[PDB]
Amino acid sequence: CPLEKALDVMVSTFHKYSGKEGDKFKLNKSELKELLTRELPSFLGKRTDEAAFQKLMSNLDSNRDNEVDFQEYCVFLSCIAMMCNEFFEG
Amino acid sequence: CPLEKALDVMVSTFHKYSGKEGDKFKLNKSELKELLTRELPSFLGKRTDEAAFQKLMSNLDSNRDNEVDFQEYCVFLSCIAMMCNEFFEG
Ligand SMILES: [Ca+2]
Ligand SMILES: [Ca+2]
Ligand SMILES: [Ca+2]
Ligand SMILES: [Ca+2]
């Protein structure tokens, strides 16, 4: 069923990228950018530079540790899901 | 991409069941029971009765309104993803 497939992909996608550099269960700035470019390309705006990307990183990383953990990653995904829920995305 | 479709599917699955009866943007008892049974079957335990089910309902229904809105449904989904993000589910 797509929903369990969907939940599984959501979890899977986190590790596919988190365990490449450093802490294997957190996404560093480099790991987060590849995940967004490769997996959520439909959502990217027109600014692809590191400065623009850094602003976003700062938004997700609640506990301020220059990394995005799984908890933080789900929050982000839910925020995306809710945004897509409105009449007009944004 | 997998993650994008996954998000799409998380959002649209909600509305495929919530709009069946009454408030079209919230799941009642029947709509939620249908959503779990048809979309998350791998996650079903042994008991299918009303009392075991309403136990789950009341946990999902944070705002006490006897129904599951989209926000509560996202929290539900986040929780499942975290459980799955363990060595032993549960
Ligand atoms: Ca990492
Ligand atoms: Ca963090
Ligand atoms: Ca309803
Ligand atoms: Ca509710």
Q: How far is the CA of A41 from the centre of ligand 1 (A)?
A: 21
Structure tokens, B44: 């079903």
- Spans of all domains in chain B: 1-90
**Are the beta carbons of A18 and A24 closer than 8 angstroms?**
yes
How far is the C-alpha of A64 from the C-alpha of B81, rounded, in Å?
23
Structure tokens, A29: 């700035």
How far is the C-alpha of A21 from the C-alpha of A12, rounded, in Å?
17
Q: Which of A79, A44, A39 is nearest to A60 (CA)?
A: A79
Would you call B81 and A75 a contact, using CB atoms and an 8 Å cutoff? no
How far is the C-alpha of B60 from the C-alpha of B33, rounded, in Å?
12
Solving technique for this entry?
A: X-ray
**Are the beta carbons of B3 and A39 closer than 8 angstroms?**
yes
The resolution in Å comes to 2.2
How far is the C-alpha of A75 from the C-alpha of B55, rounded, in Å?
25
Element (DSSP H or E) covering residue A17: helix A2-18
Q: Which CATH superfamily is domain A1-90 in?
A: EF-hand (1.10.238.10)
The amino acid occupying position B33 is K
How far is the C-alpha of A76 from the C-alpha of B82, rounded, in Å?
14
The minimum CA-CA distance between B57 and chain A, rounded to whole Å, is 19
Q: Cα dist. A48→A5, A34, A38, A56, B88 in Å? A: 30, 12, 13, 11, 39
The minimum CA-CA distance between A9 and chain B, rounded to whole Å, is 6
Would you call A74 and B81 a contact, using CB atoms and an 8 Å cutoff? yes
Nearest 5°: phi and psi at B26? -150, 145
Output the 3-class SS for chain B.
Answer: CHHHHHHHHHHHHHHHHHCCCCCCCEECHHHHHHHHHHHCHHHCCCCCCHHHHHHHHHHHCCCCCCCEEHHHHHHHHHHHHHHHCCCCCC
How far is the C-alpha of B67 from the C-alpha of B48, rounded, in Å?
19
Residue with tokens 């509305």, as numbered in its chain: B15
Would you call B3 and A10 a contact, using CB atoms and an 8 Å cutoff? yes
Q: Which of B79, B59, B63 is nearest to B26 (CA)?
A: B63
B-chain CB neighbours of A14 within 8 Å are 85
